[PDB]
Short mmCIF file of all heavy atoms in Angstrom, two decimals:
data_model
loop_
_atom_site.label_atom_id
_atom_site.label_comp_id
_atom_site.label_asym_id
_atom_site.label_seq_id
_atom_site.Cartn_x
_atom_site.Cartn_y
_atom_site.Cartn_z
N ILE A 1 6.89 0.39 1.86
CA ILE A 1 6.77 -0.91 1.19
C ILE A 1 6.96 -0.72 -0.30
O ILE A 1 6.05 -0.28 -1.00
CB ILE A 1 5.41 -1.59 1.44
CG1 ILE A 1 5.02 -1.52 2.92
CG2 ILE A 1 5.45 -3.03 0.93
CD1 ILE A 1 6.03 -2.15 3.88
N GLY A 2 8.15 -1.05 -0.79
CA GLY A 2 8.45 -0.83 -2.19
C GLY A 2 8.01 -1.96 -3.09
O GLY A 2 7.73 -3.07 -2.64
N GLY A 3 7.93 -1.68 -4.39
CA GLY A 3 7.76 -2.70 -5.40
C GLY A 3 6.38 -3.32 -5.52
O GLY A 3 6.28 -4.46 -5.94
N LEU A 4 5.33 -2.60 -5.14
CA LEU A 4 3.98 -3.15 -5.16
C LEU A 4 3.49 -3.36 -6.59
O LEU A 4 3.76 -2.55 -7.47
CB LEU A 4 3.01 -2.22 -4.42
CG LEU A 4 3.30 -1.96 -2.94
CD1 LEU A 4 2.24 -1.07 -2.32
CD2 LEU A 4 3.41 -3.29 -2.19
N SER A 5 2.78 -4.47 -6.82
CA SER A 5 2.16 -4.72 -8.12
C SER A 5 1.05 -3.70 -8.37
O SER A 5 0.49 -3.13 -7.44
CB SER A 5 1.58 -6.15 -8.18
OG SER A 5 0.42 -6.26 -7.36
N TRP A 6 0.73 -3.46 -9.65
CA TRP A 6 -0.27 -2.46 -9.99
C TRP A 6 -1.64 -2.78 -9.39
O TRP A 6 -2.44 -1.88 -9.14
CB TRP A 6 -0.40 -2.32 -11.52
CG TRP A 6 -0.89 -3.57 -12.18
CD1 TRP A 6 -0.13 -4.59 -12.66
CD2 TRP A 6 -2.26 -3.94 -12.44
NE1 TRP A 6 -0.92 -5.57 -13.20
CE2 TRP A 6 -2.24 -5.20 -13.07
CE3 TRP A 6 -3.49 -3.33 -12.19
CZ2 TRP A 6 -3.40 -5.86 -13.47
CZ3 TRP A 6 -4.65 -3.99 -12.59
CH2 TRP A 6 -4.60 -5.24 -13.22
N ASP A 7 -1.91 -4.07 -9.18
CA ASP A 7 -3.23 -4.49 -8.71
C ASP A 7 -3.30 -4.61 -7.20
O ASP A 7 -4.30 -5.06 -6.65
CB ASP A 7 -3.64 -5.83 -9.36
CG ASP A 7 -2.68 -6.95 -9.06
OD1 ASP A 7 -1.46 -6.69 -9.02
OD2 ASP A 7 -3.14 -8.10 -8.90
N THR A 8 -2.23 -4.20 -6.51
CA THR A 8 -2.23 -4.29 -5.05
C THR A 8 -3.14 -3.22 -4.47
O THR A 8 -3.08 -2.05 -4.85
CB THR A 8 -0.81 -4.14 -4.48
OG1 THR A 8 -0.02 -5.26 -4.91
CG2 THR A 8 -0.84 -4.12 -2.97
N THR A 9 -4.01 -3.63 -3.55
CA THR A 9 -4.90 -2.67 -2.90
C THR A 9 -4.43 -2.35 -1.49
O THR A 9 -3.57 -3.03 -0.94
CB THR A 9 -6.33 -3.22 -2.81
OG1 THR A 9 -6.33 -4.41 -2.04
CG2 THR A 9 -6.86 -3.53 -4.21
N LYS A 10 -5.02 -1.31 -0.92
CA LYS A 10 -4.76 -0.98 0.49
C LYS A 10 -5.11 -2.16 1.40
O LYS A 10 -4.38 -2.49 2.34
CB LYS A 10 -5.57 0.28 0.86
CG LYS A 10 -5.67 0.60 2.34
CD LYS A 10 -6.60 1.81 2.51
CE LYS A 10 -6.94 2.05 3.97
NZ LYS A 10 -6.06 3.08 4.60
N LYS A 11 -6.21 -2.83 1.09
CA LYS A 11 -6.64 -3.97 1.86
C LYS A 11 -5.65 -5.13 1.73
O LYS A 11 -5.41 -5.84 2.71
CB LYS A 11 -8.04 -4.39 1.43
CG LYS A 11 -8.67 -5.44 2.30
CD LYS A 11 -10.03 -5.80 1.75
CE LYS A 11 -10.61 -6.94 2.53
NZ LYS A 11 -9.83 -8.19 2.28
N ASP A 12 -5.09 -5.32 0.54
CA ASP A 12 -4.04 -6.33 0.36
C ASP A 12 -2.91 -6.09 1.34
O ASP A 12 -2.40 -7.03 1.97
CB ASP A 12 -3.46 -6.31 -1.06
CG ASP A 12 -4.38 -6.91 -2.11
OD1 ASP A 12 -5.32 -7.66 -1.76
OD2 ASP A 12 -4.11 -6.64 -3.30
N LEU A 13 -2.49 -4.84 1.46
CA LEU A 13 -1.40 -4.49 2.36
C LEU A 13 -1.77 -4.81 3.80
O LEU A 13 -0.99 -5.39 4.54
CB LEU A 13 -1.05 -3.00 2.25
CG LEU A 13 -0.30 -2.54 1.00
CD1 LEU A 13 -0.05 -1.05 1.09
CD2 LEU A 13 1.01 -3.30 0.88
N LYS A 14 -2.98 -4.42 4.18
CA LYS A 14 -3.43 -4.61 5.55
C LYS A 14 -3.47 -6.09 5.88
O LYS A 14 -2.98 -6.51 6.92
CB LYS A 14 -4.81 -4.00 5.78
CG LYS A 14 -5.27 -4.14 7.23
CD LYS A 14 -6.52 -3.34 7.51
CE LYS A 14 -6.97 -3.55 8.95
NZ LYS A 14 -5.83 -3.45 9.92
N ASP A 15 -4.07 -6.87 4.97
CA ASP A 15 -4.19 -8.31 5.17
C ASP A 15 -2.84 -8.99 5.27
O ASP A 15 -2.63 -9.86 6.13
CB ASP A 15 -5.00 -8.96 4.04
CG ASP A 15 -6.45 -8.51 4.01
OD1 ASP A 15 -6.96 -8.05 5.05
OD2 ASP A 15 -7.08 -8.62 2.93
N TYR A 16 -1.92 -8.62 4.38
CA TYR A 16 -0.62 -9.28 4.34
C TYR A 16 0.18 -8.95 5.59
O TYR A 16 0.73 -9.85 6.24
CB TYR A 16 0.18 -8.89 3.09
CG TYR A 16 1.55 -9.53 3.08
CD1 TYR A 16 1.72 -10.85 2.66
CD2 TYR A 16 2.67 -8.84 3.54
CE1 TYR A 16 2.97 -11.45 2.67
CE2 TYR A 16 3.92 -9.43 3.55
CZ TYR A 16 4.06 -10.74 3.12
OH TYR A 16 5.31 -11.32 3.14
N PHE A 17 0.26 -7.68 5.94
CA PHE A 17 1.17 -7.31 7.02
C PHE A 17 0.57 -7.56 8.38
O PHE A 17 1.28 -7.57 9.37
CB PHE A 17 1.62 -5.86 6.84
CG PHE A 17 2.67 -5.73 5.79
CD1 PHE A 17 2.35 -5.30 4.52
CD2 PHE A 17 3.97 -6.13 6.04
CE1 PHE A 17 3.31 -5.23 3.54
CE2 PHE A 17 4.94 -6.06 5.06
CZ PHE A 17 4.60 -5.60 3.80
N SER A 18 -0.73 -7.83 8.43
CA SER A 18 -1.38 -8.14 9.71
C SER A 18 -0.85 -9.43 10.34
O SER A 18 -1.04 -9.66 11.54
CB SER A 18 -2.90 -8.25 9.53
OG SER A 18 -3.47 -6.95 9.44
N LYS A 19 -0.19 -10.28 9.56
CA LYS A 19 0.34 -11.51 10.14
C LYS A 19 1.53 -11.23 11.06
O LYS A 19 1.89 -12.08 11.87
CB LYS A 19 0.76 -12.49 9.04
CG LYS A 19 2.11 -12.17 8.46
CD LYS A 19 2.65 -13.33 7.65
CE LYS A 19 1.81 -13.54 6.41
NZ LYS A 19 2.65 -14.09 5.31
N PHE A 20 2.12 -10.04 10.94
CA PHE A 20 3.29 -9.71 11.75
C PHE A 20 2.90 -8.94 13.01
O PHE A 20 3.73 -8.70 13.88
CB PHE A 20 4.31 -8.91 10.93
CG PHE A 20 4.75 -9.62 9.67
CD1 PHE A 20 4.19 -9.31 8.44
CD2 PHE A 20 5.72 -10.61 9.72
CE1 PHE A 20 4.60 -9.96 7.29
CE2 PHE A 20 6.13 -11.28 8.58
CZ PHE A 20 5.56 -10.94 7.36
N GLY A 21 1.63 -8.56 13.11
CA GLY A 21 1.14 -7.81 14.25
C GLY A 21 0.07 -6.82 13.83
O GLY A 21 -0.23 -6.68 12.65
N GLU A 22 -0.50 -6.11 14.81
CA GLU A 22 -1.60 -5.20 14.52
C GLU A 22 -1.18 -4.04 13.61
O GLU A 22 -0.20 -3.33 13.87
CB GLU A 22 -2.18 -4.63 15.81
CG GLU A 22 -3.48 -3.87 15.59
CD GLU A 22 -4.13 -3.45 16.89
OE1 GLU A 22 -3.96 -4.17 17.90
OE2 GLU A 22 -4.81 -2.41 16.91
N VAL A 23 -1.95 -3.86 12.55
CA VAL A 23 -1.75 -2.73 11.64
C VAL A 23 -2.70 -1.59 11.99
O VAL A 23 -3.91 -1.77 11.99
CB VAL A 23 -1.97 -3.16 10.19
CG1 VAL A 23 -1.97 -1.94 9.26
CG2 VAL A 23 -0.93 -4.18 9.77
N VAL A 24 -2.14 -0.42 12.32
CA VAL A 24 -2.98 0.73 12.66
C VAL A 24 -3.62 1.28 11.40
O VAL A 24 -4.82 1.55 11.38
CB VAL A 24 -2.16 1.84 13.35
CG1 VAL A 24 -3.05 3.06 13.64
CG2 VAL A 24 -1.55 1.32 14.63
N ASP A 25 -2.83 1.41 10.35
CA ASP A 25 -3.31 1.85 9.05
C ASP A 25 -2.26 1.50 8.01
O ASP A 25 -1.11 1.16 8.35
CB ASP A 25 -3.58 3.37 9.04
CG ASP A 25 -4.40 3.84 7.82
OD1 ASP A 25 -5.11 3.02 7.21
OD2 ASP A 25 -4.32 5.05 7.48
N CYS A 26 -2.65 1.58 6.75
CA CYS A 26 -1.72 1.41 5.64
C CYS A 26 -2.29 2.11 4.42
O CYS A 26 -3.49 2.35 4.33
CB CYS A 26 -1.47 -0.07 5.37
SG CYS A 26 -2.97 -1.02 5.13
N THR A 27 -1.43 2.46 3.48
CA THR A 27 -1.86 3.27 2.35
C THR A 27 -1.11 2.95 1.08
O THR A 27 0.02 2.48 1.12
CB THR A 27 -1.68 4.79 2.62
OG1 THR A 27 -0.28 5.07 2.79
CG2 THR A 27 -2.42 5.25 3.88
N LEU A 28 -1.74 3.23 -0.06
CA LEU A 28 -1.04 3.25 -1.33
C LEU A 28 -0.68 4.69 -1.61
O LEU A 28 -1.57 5.54 -1.68
CB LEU A 28 -1.91 2.69 -2.45
CG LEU A 28 -2.42 1.27 -2.23
CD1 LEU A 28 -3.44 0.91 -3.31
CD2 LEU A 28 -1.26 0.29 -2.23
N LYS A 29 0.61 4.99 -1.79
CA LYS A 29 0.99 6.38 -2.04
C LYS A 29 0.67 6.85 -3.46
O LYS A 29 0.90 6.14 -4.45
CB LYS A 29 2.48 6.59 -1.76
CG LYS A 29 2.91 6.35 -0.30
CD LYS A 29 2.03 7.09 0.71
CE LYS A 29 2.12 8.62 0.56
NZ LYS A 29 3.45 9.16 0.94
N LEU A 30 0.14 8.07 -3.55
CA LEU A 30 -0.17 8.70 -4.82
C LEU A 30 0.66 9.96 -5.00
O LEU A 30 1.03 10.61 -4.03
CB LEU A 30 -1.66 9.04 -4.91
CG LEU A 30 -2.63 7.90 -4.60
CD1 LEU A 30 -4.06 8.41 -4.59
CD2 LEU A 30 -2.46 6.78 -5.60
N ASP A 31 0.95 10.32 -6.25
CA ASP A 31 1.62 11.57 -6.57
C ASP A 31 0.77 12.73 -6.05
O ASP A 31 -0.42 12.82 -6.37
CB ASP A 31 1.83 11.67 -8.09
CG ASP A 31 2.72 12.83 -8.49
OD1 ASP A 31 2.29 13.99 -8.39
OD2 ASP A 31 3.85 12.58 -8.97
N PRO A 32 1.36 13.61 -5.21
CA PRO A 32 0.56 14.69 -4.60
C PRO A 32 0.04 15.72 -5.61
O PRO A 32 -0.82 16.53 -5.24
CB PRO A 32 1.55 15.37 -3.64
CG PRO A 32 2.89 14.95 -4.11
CD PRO A 32 2.73 13.58 -4.68
N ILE A 33 0.54 15.68 -6.83
CA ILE A 33 0.06 16.58 -7.87
C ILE A 33 -0.92 15.85 -8.80
O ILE A 33 -2.07 16.26 -8.95
CB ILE A 33 1.22 17.15 -8.71
CG1 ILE A 33 2.22 17.88 -7.80
CG2 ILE A 33 0.69 18.04 -9.83
CD1 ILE A 33 1.62 19.04 -7.03
N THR A 34 -0.45 14.77 -9.41
CA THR A 34 -1.25 14.11 -10.44
C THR A 34 -2.23 13.06 -9.90
O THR A 34 -3.15 12.66 -10.61
CB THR A 34 -0.34 13.44 -11.49
OG1 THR A 34 0.37 12.36 -10.88
CG2 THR A 34 0.64 14.44 -12.07
N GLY A 35 -2.02 12.62 -8.67
CA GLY A 35 -2.88 11.60 -8.08
C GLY A 35 -2.57 10.22 -8.62
O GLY A 35 -3.25 9.24 -8.30
N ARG A 36 -1.52 10.14 -9.43
CA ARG A 36 -1.12 8.88 -10.03
C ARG A 36 -0.44 7.96 -9.03
O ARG A 36 0.22 8.43 -8.10
CB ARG A 36 -0.17 9.15 -11.19
CG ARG A 36 0.12 7.91 -12.01
CD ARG A 36 1.45 8.07 -12.69
NE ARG A 36 1.36 7.76 -14.10
CZ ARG A 36 2.41 7.70 -14.90
NH1 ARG A 36 3.62 7.94 -14.40
NH2 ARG A 36 2.26 7.41 -16.19
N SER A 37 -0.59 6.66 -9.23
CA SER A 37 0.02 5.68 -8.34
C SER A 37 1.55 5.81 -8.32
O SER A 37 2.17 6.03 -9.36
CB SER A 37 -0.37 4.27 -8.77
OG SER A 37 0.24 3.30 -7.93
N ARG A 38 2.15 5.69 -7.14
CA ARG A 38 3.60 5.73 -7.03
C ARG A 38 4.20 4.33 -7.03
O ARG A 38 5.41 4.17 -7.13
CB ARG A 38 4.03 6.50 -5.78
CG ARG A 38 3.96 8.02 -5.95
CD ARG A 38 4.87 8.74 -4.98
NE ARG A 38 4.95 10.18 -5.24
CZ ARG A 38 5.69 10.73 -6.20
NH1 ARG A 38 6.43 9.96 -7.00
NH2 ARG A 38 5.69 12.05 -6.36
N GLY A 39 3.35 3.31 -6.92
CA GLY A 39 3.81 1.93 -6.97
C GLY A 39 4.48 1.49 -5.68
O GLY A 39 5.20 0.49 -5.64
N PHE A 40 4.27 2.25 -4.62
CA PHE A 40 4.68 1.81 -3.29
C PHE A 40 3.66 2.25 -2.26
O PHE A 40 2.72 2.99 -2.57
CB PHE A 40 6.10 2.32 -2.93
CG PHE A 40 6.27 3.82 -2.95
CD1 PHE A 40 5.92 4.58 -1.85
CD2 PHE A 40 6.84 4.45 -4.04
CE1 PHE A 40 6.11 5.96 -1.84
CE2 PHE A 40 7.02 5.83 -4.05
CZ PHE A 40 6.66 6.58 -2.94
N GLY A 41 3.82 1.75 -1.05
CA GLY A 41 2.86 1.99 0.00
C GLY A 41 3.55 2.20 1.33
O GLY A 41 4.78 2.12 1.44
N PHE A 42 2.75 2.49 2.35
CA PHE A 42 3.24 2.65 3.70
C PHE A 42 2.41 1.79 4.63
O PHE A 42 1.22 1.60 4.39
CB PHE A 42 3.19 4.10 4.16
CG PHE A 42 4.42 4.90 3.77
CD1 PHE A 42 4.54 5.41 2.50
CD2 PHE A 42 5.44 5.11 4.69
CE1 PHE A 42 5.66 6.14 2.13
CE2 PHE A 42 6.56 5.85 4.33
CZ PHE A 42 6.67 6.36 3.05
#
C-alpha cells in the first residue's frame, strides 16, 4: 500500500481495507536499520 500519510496508523489500514474483506494482518513498514517510517504499508 503506497503513498500513506505520515499520520496513518496500522489500525487505519485495518479499518479501511476491512471493507473489502477479512484482514489477517497489516503493517506500517519501517527501515530495517534506522526504524524510520517508509511511508508505505502492507
